Design an enzyme around this catalytic site. Structure first.
Site, mmCIF file in Angstrom:
data_model
loop_
_atom_site.group_PDB
_atom_site.id
_atom_site.type_symbol
_atom_site.label_atom_id
_atom_site.label_comp_id
_atom_site.label_asym_id
_atom_site.label_seq_id
_atom_site.Cartn_x
_atom_site.Cartn_y
_atom_site.Cartn_z
ATOM 1 N N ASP A 48 94.009 -1.050 97.727
ATOM 2 C CA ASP A 48 94.470 -1.469 99.014
ATOM 3 C C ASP A 48 93.879 -0.883 100.097
ATOM 4 O OD1 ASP A 48 95.380 1.187 98.793
ATOM 5 O OD2 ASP A 48 97.472 0.908 98.771
ATOM 6 N N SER A 50 93.438 2.591 100.742
ATOM 7 C CA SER A 50 93.627 3.977 100.818
ATOM 8 C C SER A 50 92.740 4.822 99.833
ATOM 9 C CB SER A 50 95.197 4.221 100.537
ATOM 10 O OG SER A 50 95.482 3.763 99.377
#
Ligand SMILES: [Cl-]
Ligand SMILES: [Cl-]
Ligand SMILES: [Cl-]
Ligand SMILES: [Cl-]
Ligand code: NA
Length: 129
Positions: A48, A50
């Site tokens: 994602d 991150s």
């Protein structure tokens, strides 16, 4: 810094991680082994966008600020780079808030898959605590 098994166990005990929220010291040393290989400078990118930081691979999506995870939170109120220090104080205090959020140590996928339900006491055997 790449910690030693007993060196990290003693450092984690000093910071009050032994039996914190019911998780004996072996759980934290086991998780640190499989999350970071005892390396404080460990980083890993998630799909994602991150990034996981530090000895316990604390996620930037919720817990720290790295300036590159849009729409994320900074619940531990620290830059993610502080989690890469040889002083594990930042990572421990943030880990205490993570493990108290309701899910326990299941937040660490490596702990649930490789430490949970195993003899975690073997990770502190032979250590002077
Ligand atoms: Cl233990
Ligand atoms: Cl950000
Ligand atoms: Cl330390
Ligand atoms: Cl729990
Ligand atoms: Na963040």
């Amino acid at each position: 810094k790449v910690f030693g098994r007993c060196e990290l166990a003693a450092a984690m005990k000093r910071h009050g991680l032994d039996n914190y929220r019911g998780y004996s010291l072996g759980n934290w040393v086991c998780a640190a082994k499989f999350e970071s290989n005892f390396n404080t400078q460990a980083t890993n990118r998630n799909t994602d966008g991150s990034t996981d930081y530090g000895i316990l691979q604390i996620n930037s999506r919720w817990w720290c600020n790295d300036g590159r995870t849009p729409g994320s939170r900074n619940l531990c109120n620290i830059p993610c780079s502080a989690l890469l220090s040889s002083d594990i104080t930042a990572s421990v205090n943030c880990a205490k808030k993570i493990v108290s959020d309701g899910n326990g140590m299941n937040a660490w996928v490596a702990w649930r898959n490789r430490c949970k339900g195993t003899d975690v006491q073997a990770w502190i055997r032979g250590c002077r605590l």
